[PDB]
Design a protein around this ligand. Structure first.
Ligand SMILES: O=C(O)CNC(=O)C(=O)O
Ligand SMILES: [Mn+2]
Length: 181
């Protein structure tokens, strides 16, 4: 597909990355597309990297993230060559311990981006992404449908607290070429 879904202005995501190292955007994509992505997530659960030509919903997600790639390059000069992503479905009780996405070891992943897909999430459900920001500040993100979180991979440690219900997301990374051919 060649359709490009509606999304809020990317300039704000880029300014946030520059100023704070991270950005969060509610309703990043229209609700019908987010639901279609939730559906594809469940379909795949029943690593499958996502590429154009696999499903309509995914094609539209990639088109938007490609726009975000070009916007990031423009504003922050990162030389990002591509975006890789895949679905993730955490069973109730699953958690992800504190970690950094990019090690100090040349890792090509420069910027992380997670799109959440869960309708009707409540705080009793847990499952927040917890981000460890500068100055010892912590920030929880509830994995609410349509919510996009973007951050610098080498900079923001983060974890996922266990949820009481299936937790759906689309997780990815913008990458540089890197020094190894
Ligand atoms: O799903 C989330 O919110 C967090 N995901 C990750 O930290 C990851 O896949 O590396
Ligand atoms: Mn991570």
């Amino acid at each position: 597909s060649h359709i490009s879904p509606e999304h809020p202005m990317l300039a704000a995501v880029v300014d946030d990355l520059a100023t704070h190292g991270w950005s969060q955007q509610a309703h990043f994509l229209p609700a019908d597309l987010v639901r279609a992505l939730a559906a594809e997530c469940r379909r795949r659960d029943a690593i499958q990297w996502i590429d154009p030509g696999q499903a309509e919903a995914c094609d539209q997600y990639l088109a938007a993230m490609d726009q975000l790639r070009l916007a990031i390059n423009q504003g922050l000069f990162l030389g990002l060559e591509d975006f890789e992503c895949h679905f993730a479905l955490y069973p109730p009780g699953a958690f992800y311990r504190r970690h950094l996405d990019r090690f100090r070891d040349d890792d090509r992943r420069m910027v992380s981006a997670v799109l959440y897909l869960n309708e009707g999430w409540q705080p009793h459900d847990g499952g927040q992404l917890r981000m460890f920001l500068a100055d010892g500040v912590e920030h929880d993100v509830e994995p609410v449908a349509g919510c996009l979180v973007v951050f610098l991979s080498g900079e923001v440690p983060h974890e996922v607290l266990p949820a009481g219900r299936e937790r759906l997301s689309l997780t990815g990374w913008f990458r540089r070429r890197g020094n190894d051919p």
